[PDB]
């Protein structure tokens, strides 16, 4: 199958890493960063 689900990609808002589907969130950046 092929499912397309995204929580928060690069450039999104998030308070923690868990909040970001990519797990690239930072307390300073507050946004998913590569």
Curated annotation (Swiss-Prot):
Additional remarks: Negative results: the recombinant peptide has no effect on Kv1.3/KCNA3, Kv10.1/KCNH1/EAG1, Kv11.1/KCNH2/ERG1, KCa1.1/KCNMA1, and on the drosophila Shaker IR channel.
Top-level taxon: Eukaryota
Tissue specificity note: Expressed by the venom gland.
GO cellular component, one term: extracellular region
Domain comment as written in the entry: The presence of a 'disulfide through disulfide knot' structurally defines this protein as a knottin.
Compartmental location: Secreted
Protein name in the entry: U-Asilidin(1)-Dg12
UniProt keyword list: Disulfide bond, Ion channel impairing toxin, Knottin, Neurotoxin, Secreted, Signal, Toxin
Keyword Cytoplasm: no
Role description: Neurotoxin that may modulate ions channels (other than those tested). In vivo, induces neurotoxic effects when injected into insects (tested on L.cuprina and A.domesticus).
Family: Belongs to the asilidin-1 family.
Mitochondrion recorded as keyword: no
Disulfide bonds: 7-21, 14-25, 20-32
Gene Ontology molecular function: any one: ion channel regulator activity
Organism: Dolopus genitalis
